[PDB]
């Protein structure tokens, strides 16, 4: 299946993941629109593994789109543009224990 890279749209100097990392966590397919607490809508693609990201702040379950998971904000290591969030399980029974949700508008190609 597709296995080529998704890169930072803003700087185009780093690969973040590959299409073979994409998976469906829920019924809403691998990518869907989610609404944040302030009315910003993020088309979020879920991937198992990502690279070239730096994390900001601490994990939080506030307004988590994926019950049982906490988010940590993730930004491009080169340009610091917001790319998505790392999700980490808050209980052992969950699988996967971690994944990444990447916001569609931050990535090239356009999924």
């Amino acid at each position: 299946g597709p296995s080529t890279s998704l890169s930072c749209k803003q700087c185009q100097e780093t690969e973040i993941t590959t299409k073979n990392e994409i998976f469906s966590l829920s019924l809403s397919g691998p990518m869907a629109a989610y609404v944040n607490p302030h009315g910003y809508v993020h088309e979020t693609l879920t991937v198992y593994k990502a690279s070239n990201l730096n994390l900001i702040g601490r994990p939080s379950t506030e307004h988590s789109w994926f019950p049982g998971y906490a988010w940590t904000v993730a930004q491009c290591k080169i340009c610091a543009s917001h790319i998505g969030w790392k999700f980490t399980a808050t209980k052992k029974d969950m699988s996967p224990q971690k994944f990444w949700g990447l916001t569609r508008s931050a990535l090239l190609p356009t999924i």
Binding site: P37, H38, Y40, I56, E62, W71, V73, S81, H82
Partner: peptide, 27 residues
């Protein structure tokens, strides 16, 4: 320690000044 939050992504900051710059960069 990081009381200032970005309303677009949830990024938190110690310095409100850094928040302001971060918000600008979303544009």
């Amino acid at each position: 320690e990081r009381p200032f939050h970005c309303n677009q992504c949830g990024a938190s900051f110690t310095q409100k000044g850094n928040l302001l710059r971060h918000i600008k960069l979303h544009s």
